[PDB]
Amino acid sequence: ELATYIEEQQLVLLFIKTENCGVCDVMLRKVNYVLENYNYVEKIEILLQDMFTGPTVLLFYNGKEILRESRFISLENLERTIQLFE
DSSP state of 84: T
Q: Which is nearest to 69 in space by CA: 30, 36, 20, 42?
A: 30
Experimental technique behind these coordinates: X-ray
Give the whole-angstrom CA distance, residue 57 versus residue 72.
Answer: 10
What is the residue range of 84's domain?
1-86
Structural domain count of the chain: 1
Give the whole-angstrom CA distance, residue 25 versus residue 29.
Answer: 6
Backbone angles phi, psi at 65, to 5 degrees: -80, 115
User: The CATH number of the domain where 58 resides is what?
Assistant: 3.40.30.10
